[PDB]
Design an enzyme around this catalytic site. Structure first.
Site, mmCIF file in Angstrom:
data_model
loop_
_atom_site.group_PDB
_atom_site.id
_atom_site.type_symbol
_atom_site.label_atom_id
_atom_site.label_comp_id
_atom_site.label_asym_id
_atom_site.label_seq_id
_atom_site.Cartn_x
_atom_site.Cartn_y
_atom_site.Cartn_z
ATOM 1 N N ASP A 34 -6.115 8.778 -0.554
ATOM 2 C CA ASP A 34 -5.666 7.739 0.405
ATOM 3 C C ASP A 34 -4.433 8.238 1.165
ATOM 4 O O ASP A 34 -3.549 8.844 0.558
ATOM 5 C CB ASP A 34 -5.312 6.437 -0.310
ATOM 6 N N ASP A 71 -12.278 9.738 -8.211
ATOM 7 C CA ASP A 71 -13.515 10.349 -7.715
ATOM 8 C C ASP A 71 -13.316 11.587 -6.818
ATOM 9 O O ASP A 71 -14.289 12.105 -6.274
ATOM 10 C CB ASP A 71 -14.381 9.302 -6.987
ATOM 11 N N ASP A 91 -15.910 -4.060 9.280
ATOM 12 C CA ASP A 91 -17.156 -3.571 8.676
ATOM 13 C C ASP A 91 -17.918 -4.568 7.800
ATOM 14 O O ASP A 91 -18.947 -4.212 7.241
ATOM 15 C CB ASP A 91 -16.928 -2.246 7.920
ATOM 16 N N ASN A 140 -7.426 9.495 -5.823
ATOM 17 C CA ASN A 140 -8.289 8.598 -6.607
ATOM 18 C C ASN A 140 -9.049 9.406 -7.644
ATOM 19 O O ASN A 140 -9.116 10.632 -7.550
ATOM 20 C CB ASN A 140 -9.281 7.862 -5.704
ATOM 21 N N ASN A 181 -8.878 5.862 3.059
ATOM 22 C CA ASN A 181 -9.556 6.724 2.110
ATOM 23 C C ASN A 181 -10.388 7.842 2.784
ATOM 24 O O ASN A 181 -11.102 7.599 3.757
ATOM 25 C CB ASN A 181 -10.464 5.808 1.269
ATOM 26 N N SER A 199 -11.486 11.705 -3.916
ATOM 27 C CA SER A 199 -10.966 11.290 -2.610
ATOM 28 C C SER A 199 -9.453 11.026 -2.645
ATOM 29 O O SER A 199 -8.838 10.946 -3.708
ATOM 30 C CB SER A 199 -11.710 10.045 -2.104
ATOM 31 N N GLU A 207 0.813 -1.230 0.000
ATOM 32 C CA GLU A 207 0.000 0.000 0.000
ATOM 33 C C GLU A 207 0.846 1.281 0.000
ATOM 34 O O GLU A 207 0.554 2.235 -0.740
ATOM 35 C CB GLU A 207 -0.962 0.007 1.196
#
Ligand SMILES: C[C@@H](O)CN1CCN(CC(=O)O)CCN(CC(=O)O)CCN(CC(=O)O)CC1
Ligand SMILES: C[C@@H](O)CN1CCN(CC(=O)O)CCN(CC(=O)O)CCN(CC(=O)O)CC1
Ligand SMILES: [Gd]
Length: 128
Positions: free
Chosen positions: A52, A48, A101, A46, A59, A50, A35
């Site tokens: 990281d 869209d 989650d 990213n 995110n 957003s 990562e």
């Protein structure tokens, strides 16, 4: 901070990641390598809007506030910049919420493609 492998493993173990939700320590060290290359200051944008952040590339769409991702949530209740710290406490605590989650570690794309189904123990071999 750019961590060493065993240094990171020991920090991760201290904060309770070994076997958290059934994921052995080697999975987490593997994910962090691919990562972020063990670098707490890593950021990646990213498509869209957003971004990281940190050793586990959390995110800003759902998890932290960076002030430039409109209509986003902040479920770890932290500034995204707190995730770039030499102290991985905030990263670890937020990651505990994510892996809980329903989706497990599949939320980390690099873990799914490069760590899942492999010998993850090899990532902590040699460490005290
Ligand atoms: C302790 C040594 O391993 C350090 N190492 C010495 C040279 N290595 C020899 C080898 O790894 O076989 C070849 C290059 N090495 C390939 C790789 O590891 O994937 C990448 C750089 N490495 C990254 C790392 O090893 O953490 C640092 C330097
Ligand atoms: C050249 C060696 O580096 C070979 N290495 C196999 C043996 N390594 C030795 C070591 O890293 O000390 C131990 C396991 N290794 C841990 C790590 O890399 O952090 C994960 C797999 N590596 C990934 C990589 O190197 O990028 C594949 C190649
Ligand atoms: Gd290696």
């Amino acid at each position: 901070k750019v961590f060493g492998r065993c240094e990171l493993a020991a920090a991760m173990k201290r904060h309770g990641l070994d076997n958290y939700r059934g994921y052995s320590l080697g999975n987490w060290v593997c994910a962090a390598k691919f990562e972020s290359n063990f670098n707490t200051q890593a950021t990646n944008r990213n498509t869209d809007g957003s971004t990281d952040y940190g050793i586990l590339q959390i995110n800003s769409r759902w998890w932290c506030n960076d002030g430039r991702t409109p209509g986003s949530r902040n479920l770890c209740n932290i500034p995204c910049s707190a995730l770039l710290s030499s102290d991985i406490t905030a990263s670890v605590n937020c990651a505990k919420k994510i892996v809980s989650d329903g989706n497990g570690m599949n939320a980390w794309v690099a873990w799914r493609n490069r760590c899942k189904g492999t010998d993850v123990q090899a990532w902590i071999r040699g460490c005290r």
